[PDB]
Design a protein around this ligand. Structure first.
Ligand SMILES: Nc1ncnc2c1ncn2[C@@H]1O[C@H](COP(=O)(O)OP(=O)(O)OP(=O)(O)O)[C@@H](O)[C@H]1O
Ligand SMILES: Nc1ncnc2c1ncn2[C@@H]1O[C@H](COP(=O)(O)OP(=O)(O)OP(=O)(O)O)[C@@H](O)[C@H]1O
Ligand SMILES: [Mg+2]
Ligand SMILES: [Mg+2]
Ligand SMILES: [Mg+2]
Lengths: 307, 308
């Protein structure tokens, strides 16, 4: 029983100071392993659940830091193809109080396609997770479509976190790609701000009811500093947030998701899984760095206990 | 009203803060810094006071802005710099003998430069057009360059060419031809010592150079790294020794040497003066870190030469 994801893998370069602009020489920190699917799958493995990822990186040091990190953490990296003529994706980020310069679409991670999805790699996959952020081109979609149908046809469970960029919604083809995934989704994990996106219904209550009636088995709604909710035909509950000192919210959704999926793989019931997921996301935001907020079971449990 | 123009890639460079710093581990980096052979060449030209412009493409981000701001502030005509919303401004990560790089040019805004992104209303007063071989990495680039060249030669302009190519391009017949194509329309050839035989059928520099001149090239300026440079014309031939300096970054040496030569010639310097100034410029260039941070003003070169 293995958990698999697919998508962009990149390195993040972070500005050394708040307010630091992009158009002035300065000091930066990095590279740091990154990319929503990678963060998610890193959290899954740190919780002791077998998993793998399908992506494309370039034949360079930036691709290496990612492969090395995931591999050392227990992730099956056979699915990460290395592209000699492409540069590994990157993202420069600066703060205020947030701002980015992305090289994802036209980078190695954007070369992912059906040809780079090895069906044999998914032969024993029981759960496949999709990040909406990965659907930014026809090839990304073809890759996702191929992997999802292989797993679904093999009786696997599909989970989907629509962490998309609102822009993609104005693009029919991407809008249709998102509808595709949802149509085959068992576990839908939108944040409150994303609940209405892929629904013909205008009120959240109505949208969620719609997802269930359409085929989804469970809807997990992330509410940031307000906690999280769980919805199924069988039950419905909510958990309050754990008050923490937020530093970086960029990996909260990814970690919360990996925790939910991993805990469920470990046999946790909905209530316990939601509690751990909630605590995992809270812990993630207390540290800077994309993948620096993932936690292991012991840390999550101690955090819960202390509260 | 007479202007020197160039065309090509504009990118930013992000440098490793320490020697021995790997790309596969977190650390500290310095940047972004304005870069790109054509950009450094043109920055040296404008710093010498010679009116100039550049045709290039950058993305709609801060990395694109730092280059436009620097060039504009230095006096370069940047109207030929198009901003592409759907693309990312090229970049280059480097770390320290070898420099080691991670490039994003071919698939960035740089490689989007199209023959249409050129014009001619922009090159109307261009009497000198300079080409960097490092820019010819796609048929779209060669097209943009071919168009610009036709336009400039139509108004009776002069073409200068610096073959700072990646030897690899020589095995791709298409690019191999683009380069030979440009060479046949070149008036001023400026290969480095290790690039002299590349576009030549001969195997000895003497022969290679004698061939370029026979074919039509009027001047061949050979850069010899830390051993000076040589000038070759059908009528004369001479060389200058290198100035001893504490080298720190060789990245922009050739580009600065090039801008200095072209600009000094525009200011009426004879071949002998221009060669010593270009030579000194390249010498000064390598003393500071950063691709475009070593350019010099005319009198800085003058004093450099004097003092010594
Ligand atoms: N400031 C916070 N304090 C406590 N818990 C938080 C905070 N922010 C997030 N969380 C926890 O993490 C889960 C992850 O959440 P968030 O709602 O930011 O994810 P998301 O909406 O998917 O965002 P993303 O755009 O990064 O994918 C939340 O539902 C919550 O349980
Ligand atoms: N270490 C050095 N010491 C003194 N002068 C130097 C040094 N390096 C370069 N120069 C001067 O600068 C000119 C610029 O030279 P270099 O040979 O590195 O350029 P190039 O071979 O064209 O390289 P590129 O590919 O960067 O364009 C030289 O011919 C020389 O006069
Ligand atoms: Mg379509
Ligand atoms: Mg969110
Ligand atoms: Mg050289």
């Amino acid at each position: 029983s293995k958990v698999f994801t697919i998508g962009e893998i990149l390195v993040e370069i972070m500005a050394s100071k708040i307010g630091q602009p992009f158009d002035q020489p300065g000091i930066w920190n990095g590279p740091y392993p990154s990319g929503a699917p990678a963060i998610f799958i890193d959290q899954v493995t740190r919780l002791g659940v077998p998993c793998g990822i399908i992506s494309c990186v370039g034949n360079d040091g930036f691709g290496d830091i990612n492969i090395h990190r995931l591999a050392a953490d227990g992730v099956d990296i056979r699915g990460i193809s290395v592209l000699p003529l492409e540069a590994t994706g990157s993202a420069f980020v600066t703060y205020h109080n947030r701002d980015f310069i992305f090289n994802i679409k036209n980078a190695a991670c954007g070369k992912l396609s059906a040809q780079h999805v090895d069906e044999n790699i998914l032969k024993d996959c029981t759960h496949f997770h999709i990040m909406g952020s990965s659907l930014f081109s026809f090839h990304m979609v073809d890759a996702v479509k191929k992997a999802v149908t292989i797993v679904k046809a093999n009786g696997g469970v599909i989970s989907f976190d629509p962490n998309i960029r609102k822009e993609m919604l104005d693009i029919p083809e991407m809008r249709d790609a998102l509808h595709f995934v949802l149509e085959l989704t068992d576990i839908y994990m939108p944040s409150e701000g994303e609940v209405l996106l892929l629904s013909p219904h205008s009120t959240p209550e109505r949208a969620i009811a719609g997802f269930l009636e359409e085929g989804v088995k469970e809807v997990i709604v992330k509410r940031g500093n307000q906690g999280a909710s769980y919805y199924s035909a069988n039950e419905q509950f909510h958990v309050e947030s754990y008050p923490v000192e937020e530093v970086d919210p960029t990996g909260a959704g990814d970690c919360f998701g990996g925790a939910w999926i991993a805990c469920r793989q470990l046999g946790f019931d909905a209530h316990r899984a939601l509690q751990y997921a909630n605590a995992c996301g809270a812990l993630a935001v207390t540290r800077r760095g994309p993948m620096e907020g993932t936690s292991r079971l012991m840390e999550i449990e101690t955090f819960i206990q202390r509260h």
